[PDB]
């Protein structure tokens, strides 16, 4: 489609399911980007979901890179952009010291 299969940079904005593949302890995630401004995700759900994080991000283009920031603004995840397109968005783990995660992102399978 017109433009809609690239990495767009509204196109990331949307809701995305963590949930492909999908871990166990039934460990289920949405993260939420904002346009510009910031970003919800929960992980955990033992119980219930409705205490989620939200924070600040960051994003440059210089090796397509992005790192996410806590309200306490002392980062917590960093991963390489592979693609986005209109359902499709590849966070290749890029730091394997750090512990980030390396799944596909499908948009959300309401």
């Known amino acids: 489609g017109d433009e809609d299969d ?8 949307g809701k995305w399911i963590v949930k492909e593949p999908v871990l166990q302890d039934d460990f289920v995630t949405c993260y939420t980007f904002n346009a ?6 929960y992980t955990g759900s033992p ?3 409705g205490v989620p994080f939200r924070g600040t991000y960051i994003i440059s283009l210089d090796e397509k890179l992005i790192k996410l920031y806590d ?10 952009i592979l693609k986005l397109t209109s359902k499709e968005m590849k966070w290749e783990n890029a730091s394997p010291k750090d512990g980030n995660s390396d799944k596909r992102l499908e948009k959300y399978n309401d």
């Open 36 to 41: 510009d401004k910031t970003y919800e995700v």
């Open 6 to 13: 690239k990495v767009e940079i509204p196109q990331l904005v």
């Open 71 to 80: 309200k306490e603004e002392h980062c917590t995840e960093q991963y390489h």
């Open 47 to 49: 119980l219930s979901n």
